[PDB]
Design an enzyme around this catalytic site. Structure first.
Site, short mmCIF file in Angstrom:
data_model
loop_
_atom_site.label_atom_id
_atom_site.label_comp_id
_atom_site.label_asym_id
_atom_site.label_seq_id
_atom_site.Cartn_x
_atom_site.Cartn_y
_atom_site.Cartn_z
N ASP A 1 11.81 -44.36 -17.76
CA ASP A 1 11.43 -42.84 -17.89
C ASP A 1 11.34 -42.34 -16.35
O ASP A 1 10.93 -41.11 -16.27
CB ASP A 1 9.90 -43.05 -18.41
CG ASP A 1 9.65 -41.58 -18.97
OD1 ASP A 1 10.52 -40.65 -18.93
OD2 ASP A 1 8.42 -41.35 -19.50
N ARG B 1 5.06 -32.50 -24.20
CA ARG B 1 3.74 -32.70 -23.79
C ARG B 1 2.92 -31.64 -24.01
O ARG B 1 1.44 -31.85 -23.86
CB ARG B 1 3.76 -33.11 -22.17
CG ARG B 1 4.87 -34.21 -21.81
CD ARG B 1 4.91 -34.48 -20.49
NE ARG B 1 5.68 -35.75 -20.32
CZ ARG B 1 5.84 -36.06 -18.92
NH1 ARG B 1 5.48 -35.46 -17.90
NH2 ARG B 1 6.61 -37.46 -18.92
N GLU C 1 14.51 -37.00 -16.30
CA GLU C 1 13.97 -37.63 -17.22
C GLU C 1 12.45 -37.91 -16.30
O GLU C 1 12.46 -38.94 -15.65
CB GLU C 1 14.62 -39.00 -17.50
CG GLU C 1 13.44 -39.51 -18.59
CD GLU C 1 14.15 -40.41 -19.67
OE1 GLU C 1 15.48 -40.44 -19.51
OE2 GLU C 1 13.69 -41.02 -20.49
N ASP C 2 11.57 -36.72 -15.97
CA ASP C 2 10.40 -36.86 -15.29
C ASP C 2 10.59 -37.18 -14.10
O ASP C 2 10.14 -38.26 -13.41
CB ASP C 2 9.55 -37.88 -16.35
CG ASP C 2 9.42 -37.48 -17.68
OD1 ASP C 2 9.57 -36.57 -17.93
OD2 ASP C 2 9.07 -38.46 -18.37
N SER C 3 11.30 -36.29 -13.31
CA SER C 3 11.60 -36.67 -11.98
C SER C 3 11.53 -34.97 -11.19
O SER C 3 11.64 -34.06 -11.92
CB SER C 3 12.95 -37.35 -11.68
OG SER C 3 13.10 -37.00 -10.32
#
Ligand SMILES: [Mg+2]
Ligand SMILES: [Zn+2]
Ligand SMILES: [Zn+2]
Ligand SMILES: [Zn+2]
Lengths: 48, 469, 66, 50, 49, 50, 49, 258, 115, 47, 47, 299
Positions: free
Chosen positions: D37, B366, B196-198
């Site tokens: 997030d 995105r 998750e966005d890492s």
RNA sequence: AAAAUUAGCUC
């Protein structure tokens, strides 16, 4: 940064003069070439 | 007779000619176009290309009558044109009456936007997020940084240059003072710690000095005449005369009271030996908790008032660790989740282990195709051996041609390659997408945000804990 | 600010190749040819010489004394 | 807990586990309630004393 | 200013870099910059509703 | 309130949904008041000695 | 002081930018020359009226 | 219920890299030998830098960091030295470390280039890579600056830090034709043939093979210059053998105790 | 600031056992071997070797957590072949194989040099 | 006629069964595929 | 017997400055001067 | 080997290897067969996969689906179908919902842990990614998209002609301008939908955008359509781009140019870049979105 | 063991 007299500073604008952000050359350039509208912060309107 | 800033506005519908000369009228220069042809002919280009040798400059163009400054209030009455050749040759009669013609469309972008490669290949929100996040990137902020005593100055060890640079940033000076490194990024979900966005960074890469930056922190302190009996002075507060005193080491500094350069310091340690006579009170400053730095240099001088004014700055080598916030040039922010050693990171047919691994799922939602184009063109540029172009509107850089080029180096025309499970050594069924791509490092280190408390100091007005790390 | 000592991804020594790369570019060669003339096969190690910026010069301009 | 507590499923207990590096961690499935997030979030952690 | 049209040599000798854009004051040893404010153009008639 | 912590967060699938990966510094800094009792007097004695 | 390195770097930079200028010009003339056909999928442009 | 009889065949031996092939062995063994090449290979490297006077323009830690990355020839010394942690003495004894000294000062007007050649080692054989091609640039000094320090080296392996990473890049690859289908090409025609591909230029990838195990692992170990490649392979094999031996001893003791 | 040192990945800590045997209860003849300060390098090959052995009904390792330096190997043999001897046999044959590979590699090199 | 209101657009189809009236006539809108009953007027969406 | 030697700003000349003294270079005369490195055992690990 | 390895990442494995779905010619387990062991207790539930064709229950093969849909779980063993968000996500009657309602909360916690710890370790072998190869069409879909866009442009031009010559009669309840705008918007939306459908039908099972969308993990069909087919109209304040200047959007375009590109219609796609004018309009749309986000957070 | 205030940045 209070663009006015000391005695009536609160009555004048705020943030007119800021500390130049020397964190990276791009940031410096952006800062030196920036604008700021006088409209009140967090206004209900959305046209401006 | 009329300077170039003046503007004349012709109002056709109602017969009014309004001319403005006061300051502030934001304007920009454009080329003139008499009938269907520009005034900027080969003569001008030649004379200008020989500039910096004789004397030729922009003022020559402005005087010759080829360019012209139009202000926004006048821009509403001119049939502008995007590119000279394309919009004028001969077709269905659109306007066939252009009056000006823009220099280059990409010149709309700003300072932080311009360094975005292929901005037109990304959804606007991500372009905006990148514009904001660029100002938070680390690197060499100014060449003479060793003389500055500013507060909170970051500097990166090896700030490489983008493998793909826009023609606009040549003048933005970015290439002389870059703010990131070109890393071999592999978009995939290796283990899961980048879901998750890492991102997953290469432990060996960091060991070798990958994105290794430095953190400075300056200090300001001077003595002054508090009152007729009160007075400050630099002096080691001993255990006997000084009543007010901290439970910290003081001998670490020299007799003059200023800690010498190149001395280990930690949180809650005396940096300046200020004492104020009442016998004396230890009104001296200490290094902030959780800083753990080393003293770079000590500056002593006299302020305008003439008192002894000294500045001290402490440097700290910030190794990239998990929790640090990175971001590409397309708004794909993230925080290093876990770091693996080279033995564990996957690898291509040859020993090319990715340096960063973002989440694939970050792309579709995105819509940052610009990031993929950047990676592909970066791989091509690396192989060829020269910097590639990523100007926004080029009409001569598509994906098909870039792929065709890449296919002439024994690589999949789309950039995908076959990796190997770092652990077991089995090929990965899917063909991972790996290539060079320019990554930044924001200042939001973890160690500057971590905080805790157990019955700390209390306020004076309402007996409740304090606020702020 | 200075050429690294090793390629981040690969690990091949690249620090000892900056002067040679500059000389090869100066005499006649082009980058794409100079790079393989030095022996940099993997594209991961080429970014070291192509992308690297040389700020140590600007730093040396600020001579402390004399 | 995560700073904007919109609904009940925004402050749940957890069992502690200490890990070397200096970052709070939590299983991804539990990300949806908090609305976290892992892009530089912050999440508070209170401890009872009884 | 003291660096008006000065060569990069002297700038380097004055512990300054030729790349610094400039255009920012120095008060109390801090770089202060004036943000360009905007307002309605004067001496122009507007008809709002 | 005291006994609070605020740190960045990162994913960690190997932990159960009810677990949380606190660091070591924060764990050491906070404390939990525990009543002594002969069932566990030895453990607290060892902790105090450490 | 700048006889070596500091001067060689400038020399290589100037020659490299000149080489890049000529490279760009030759690329431009070549692009103009090879005007046989241009049939590509990933590109488009507006055409009003 | 026993092991296998692997065969080896070198295709290209040079003083810079070795390309060989291993046949009749399991994938796990191949990849494990790889990870041992990269991670667990003893080697000498600078690990303790004491800086006495540094007037250069770089940080104090920058010099130590760079000096950490300069390779050191350890063809016959790594095997003899003992890990500093296991030494039975105080201070870096020569029996368990190799000392280095550097003292340069730019006096003339032209800028100096402090290269690895300034690292005057006490031992003859433990030197940076300059014996037989410029030298690793450390830092640049200008008239009036100086850099005096001494550092010690100690034996380590890549697992602890990258400085102990002898191999530049290991090219590991098996089954060049995608015969075991371990990867599925959406469009096989679009991919370029592997260097080791025996398949002709017409066909794209070999036909599937159900009863097929991975053999013929292709290696391209590439020494950074510290150790010779074949020496890297021999050291990795010996180290893995030793780790297995220790594990077997520990298990035996555990069982006997029970 | 809380980054662990690099030596904690391979060096044993005082009191920690290198290898621990723990019999399982769910199925007969099944043990879990726990190894401290190791990684996939020393577990994957053993897993494969155990797979080669026919008398081994089940074999597999895991890493409880990447930040923790520990692995667990589960072995389950026929009732007439305890897993301990299976592990010993696997390691013994694997050592023999690596030694043979080393010898062959050495002879191949010495023949390659001028030969 | 002018006083009326324009009917909501959509792709009418009988492939979807409305659960509120049992009829097969209905109209779909893709954007998640929303379903509007034709006669009964059942409203639903499919993901 | 340490008189707290300093380094002039621009002269880069040493000076001997004691307490209760003006901060100026022995020659020319400037108001800026830095300190000299410590003598402690500055030991780094090349990690 | 892989089955025995995955089992190690299972906190509730009884310790017995299940009978492989295929004994000869070689013992091969199936994905569903392994995933069953993850499901606790004896659960029973029925769910429909995302790509379940509606006209399948009515026709034959209702209980044996060619597309492997119609998720059927009995005695806590997966039998048919492909699991997606509809069955594992947060939805009423999802598999986890049933597990929580039937089995205890702790059983559900173990279920989650086992699912993740097994699926990632298997993803190591499988591998997931995204790249240009997953964004490129088949060179015919481009032809269809171009033809559709040209038809849309022609139709909007004809509508404008009729409006100019006074043939478009006011639609009931709306003024002439309102009906003109409504017709143009419907035409453009229909064109965008047709292009998106064409792009979707032109993908391959190996494509990664489609995999992530159908699994519902992250994305949507509209994202793919914008990435490949065409971005679409860039509305602001629920209308097309206004006339900031005197009767025209930007200085480039001529006055009274209601055409699609002169009002915001981004005809290109994110893969093929954007013309400057439509780039500016896309920026305006994004800015509107951000403002709405801020005011919503404030209110 | 210390005030009033403003600004920038972040989920
Ligand atoms: Mg976030
Ligand atoms: Zn490389
Ligand atoms: Zn010793
Ligand atoms: Zn003086």
């Amino acid at each position: 940064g209070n663009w006015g007299d000391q005695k009536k500073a609160h009555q004048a604008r705020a943030g007119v003069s800021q500390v130049l952000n020397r964190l990276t050359f791009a940031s410096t350039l952006s800062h030196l070439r920036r604008l700021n509208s006088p409209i009140g912060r967090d206004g209900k309107l959305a046209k401006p | 007779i009329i300077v170039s800033e003046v503007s004349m506005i012709r109002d056709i519908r109602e017969r009014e000619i309004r001319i403005y000369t006061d300051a502030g009228r934001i304007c920009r220069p454009l080329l003139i176009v008499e009938k269907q042809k520009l005034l900027l002919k080969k003569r001008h280009i030649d004379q200008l290309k020989e500039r910096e040798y004789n004397n030729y400059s922009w003022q020559d163009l402005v005087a010759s009558g080829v360019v012209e400054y139009i202000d926004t209030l006048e821009e509403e009455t001119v049939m502008l044109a995007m590119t000279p050749d394309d919009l004028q040759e001969k077709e269905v009669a659109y306007c066939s009456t252009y009056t000006h013609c823009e220099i280059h469309p990409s010149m709309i972008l700003g300072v932080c936007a311009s360094i975005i490669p292929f901005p037109d290949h990304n959804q606007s929100p991500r372009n905006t997020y990148q514009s904001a996040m660029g100002k938070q990137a680390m690197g060499v902020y100014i060449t003479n940084f060793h003389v500055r005593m500013d507060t909170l100055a970051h500097v990166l060890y090896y700030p490489q240059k983008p493998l793909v640079t826009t023609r606009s940033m040549e003048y933005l000076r970015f290439r002389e003072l870059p703010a990131g490194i070109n890393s071999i990024v592999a978009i995939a979900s290796y283990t899961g710690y980048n879901q998750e966005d890492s991102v997953i960074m290469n432990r060996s890469a960091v060991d070798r000095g990958f994105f290794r930056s430095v953190f400075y922190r300056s200090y300001k302190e001077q003595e002054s005449k508090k009152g007729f009996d009160q007075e400050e002075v630099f002096e080691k507060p001993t255990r006997e005369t000084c009543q007010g005193m901290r439970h910290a080491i003081y001998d670490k500094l020299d007799d003059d009271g200023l800690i010498a350069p190149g001395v280990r310091v930690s949180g809650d340690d005396v940096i300046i030996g200020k004492t104020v006579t009442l016998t004396k009170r230890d009104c001296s400053t200490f290094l902030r908790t959780s800083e753990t730095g080393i003293v770079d240099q000590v500056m002593v001088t006299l302020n305008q008032e003439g008192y002894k004014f000294c500045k001290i700055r402490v440097r700290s080598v910030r190794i990239p660790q998990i929790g640090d916030k990175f971001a590409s040039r397309h708004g794909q922010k993230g925080t290093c989740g876990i770091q693996y050693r080279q033995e564990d990171m996957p690898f291509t047919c040859e020993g090319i282990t990715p340096d960063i691994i973002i989440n694939p799922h970050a792309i579709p939602s995105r819509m940052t195709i610009g990031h993929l184009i950047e990676c592909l063109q970066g791989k091509v540029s690396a192989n060829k051996g020269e910097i590639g172009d990523a100007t926004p509107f080029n009409d001569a850089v598509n994906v098909q041609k870039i792929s065709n080029l890449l296919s002439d180096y024994g690589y999949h025309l789309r950039g995908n390659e076959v990796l190997y499970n770092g652990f077991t050594g089995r090929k990965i069924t899917s063909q991972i997408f790996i290539g060079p791509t320019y990554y930044q490092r924001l200042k939001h280190m973890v160690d500057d945000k971590i905080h805790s408390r157990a019955r700390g100091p209390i306020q004076i007005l309402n007996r409740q804990p304090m606020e702020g790390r | 600010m200075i050429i690294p000592v090793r390629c981040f991804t690969c690990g091949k020594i690249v620090g000892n190749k900056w002067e040679a790369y500059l000389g090869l570019l100066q005499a006649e060669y082009t980058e794409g040819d100079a790079l393989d003339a030095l022996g940099l096969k993997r594209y991961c190690c080429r970014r070291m010489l192509l992308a690297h910026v040389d700020l140590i010069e600007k730093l040396l301009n600020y001579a402390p004394l004399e | 807990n995560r700073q904007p507590t919109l609904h009940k499923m925004s402050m749940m207990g957890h069992r502690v586990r200490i890990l070397p590096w200096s970052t709070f961690r939590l299983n991804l499935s539990v990300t949806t309630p908090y609305n976290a997030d892992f892009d530089g979030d912050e999440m508070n952690l209170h401890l009872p004393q009884s | 200013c003291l660096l008006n049209g000065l060569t990069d040599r002297d700038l380097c000798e004055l512990n300054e870099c030729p790349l610094d854009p400039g255009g920012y004051f120095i008060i109390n040893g801090s770089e202060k910059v004036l943000i360009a404010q905007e307002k309605m153009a004067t001496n122009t008639v507007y008809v709002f509703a | 309130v005291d006994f609070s912590a605020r740190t960045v967060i990162t994913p960690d699938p190997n932990l159960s949904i009810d677990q949380v990966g606190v660091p070591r510094s924060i764990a050491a800094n906070m404390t939990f008041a525990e009543i002594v009792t002969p069932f566990n007097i030895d453990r607290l004695q060892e902790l105090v000695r450490r | 002081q700048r006889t070596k390195n500091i001067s060689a770097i400038s020399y290589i930079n100037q020659r490299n930018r000149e080489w890049n200028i000529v490279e760009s010009e030759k690329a431009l003339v070549a692009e103009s020359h090879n005007m046989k056909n241009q049939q590509m999928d990933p590109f488009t442009r507006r055409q009003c009226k | 219920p026993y092991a296998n009889q692997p065969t080896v065949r070198i295709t290209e031996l040079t003083d810079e890299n070795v390309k060989f092939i291993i046949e009749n062995t399991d994938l796990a063994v191949a990849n494990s030998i790889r990870r041992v090449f990269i991670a667990e290979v003893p080697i000498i490297a600078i690990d303790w830098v004491q800086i006495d006077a540094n007037s250069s323009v770089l940080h104090d830690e920058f010099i130590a960091h760079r000096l950490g990355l300069i390779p050191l020839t350890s063809d016959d010394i790594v095997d003899k030295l003992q890990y500093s942690r296991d030494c039975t003495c105080e201070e870096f004894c020569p029996e368990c470390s190799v000392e280095f000294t550097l003292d340069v000062r730019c006096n003339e007007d032209q800028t100096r280039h402090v290269t690895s050649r300034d690292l005057i080692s006490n031992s003859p054989r433990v030197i940076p890579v300059t014996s037989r091609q410029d030298d690793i640039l450390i830092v640049k000094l200008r008239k009036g600056q100086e850099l005096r320090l001494r550092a010690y080296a100690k034996k380590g392996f890549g697992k602890e830090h990258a400085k102990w990473n002898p191999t530049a890049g290991v090219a590991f690859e098996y089954d060049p034709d995608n015969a075991l289908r371990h990867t599925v090409y959406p469009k096989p025609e679009e991919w370029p043939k592997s260097e080791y591909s025996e398949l002709d230029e017409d066909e794209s990838q070999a036909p599937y093979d159900p009863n097929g195990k991975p053999e013929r692992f292709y290696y391209n170990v590439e020494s950074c210059g510290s150790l010779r490649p074949e020496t890297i392979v021999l050291s990795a094999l010996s180290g893995l053998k030793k780790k297995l031996s220790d594990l077997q001893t520990q298990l035996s003791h555990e069982i006997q105790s029970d | 600031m809380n980054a662990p040192p690099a030596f904690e990945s391979f060096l044993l800590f005082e009191g920690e056992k290198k290898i621990t045997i723990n019999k399982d209860t769910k199925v007969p003849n099944a043990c879990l071997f726990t190894i401290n300060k190791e990684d996939h390098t020393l577990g994957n090959i053993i897993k494969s070797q155990l797979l080669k052995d026919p008398q081994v009904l089940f074999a597999g390792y895991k890493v409880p957590h990447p930040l923790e330096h520990k692995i667990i190997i589960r072995v389950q043999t026929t009732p007439d072949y305890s897993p301990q001897e299976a592990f010993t046999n696997a390691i013994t044959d694997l050592i023999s194989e690596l030694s043979l590979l080393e010898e062959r590699f050495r002879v191949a090199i010495k023949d390659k040099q001028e030969g | 006629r002018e006083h009326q209101m324009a009917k909501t657009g959509g792709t009418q189809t009988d492939l979807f069964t409305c659960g509120k009236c049992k009829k097969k006539n209905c109209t779909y809108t893709q954007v998640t595929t929303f379903v509007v009953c034709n006669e009964c007027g059942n409203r639903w969406k499919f993901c | 017997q340490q008189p707290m030697i300093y380094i002039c700003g621009e002269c880069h000349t040493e000076n001997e400055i004691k307490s209760r003294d003006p901060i100026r270079c022995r020659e020319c005369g400037y108001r800026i001067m830095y300190k000299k490195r410590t003598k402690r055992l500055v030991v780094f690990d090349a990690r | 080997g892989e089955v025995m390895n995955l089992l190690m990442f299972l906190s509730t494995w009884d310790g017995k290897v299940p009978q492989p779905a295929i004994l000869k010619p070689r013992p091969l387990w199936t994905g569903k067969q392994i995933f069953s062991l993850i499901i606790p207790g004896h659960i029973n539930c029925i769910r429909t996969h995302s790509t379940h064709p509606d006209d399948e229950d009515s026709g034959p093969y209702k209980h044996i689906s060619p597309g492997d849909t119609k998720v059927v779980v009995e005695n806590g063993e997966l039998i048919m179908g492909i699991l997606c968000k509809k069955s594992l996500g947060t939805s009423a009657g999802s598999l986890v919902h049933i597990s929580y309602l039937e089995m205890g909360h702790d059983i559900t916690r173990l279920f989650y842990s086992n699912i993740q710890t097994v699926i990632n370790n298997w993803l190591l072998i499988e591998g997931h990614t995204i790249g240009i190869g997953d964004s490129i069409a088949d060179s015919k879909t481009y032809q269809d998209i171009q033809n559709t866009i040209k038809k849309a442009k022609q139709d909007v031009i004809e509508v404008i002609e009729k409006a100019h010559n006074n043939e478009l009669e006011p639609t009931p309840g709306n003024t002439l301008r309102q009906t003109f705008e409504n017709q143009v918007n419907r035409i453009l939306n229909d064109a965008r939908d047709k292009t998106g459908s064409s792009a979707q039908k032109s993908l391959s099972e190996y494509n990664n955008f489609k995999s992530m969308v159908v699994s519902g993990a992250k994305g949507s069909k509209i994202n793919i359509s914008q990435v490949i087919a065409v971005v679409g109209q860039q509305n602001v304040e629920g209308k097309r781009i206004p006339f900031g200047f005197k009767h025209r959007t930007l200085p480039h375009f001529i006055k009274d140019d209601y055409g699609p590109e002169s009002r915001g219609f981004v005809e290109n796609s994110y893969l093929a870049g954007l013309t400057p004018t439509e780039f500016f309009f896309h920026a305006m749309g994004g800015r509107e979105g951000l403002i709405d986000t801020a005011v919503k957070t404030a209110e």
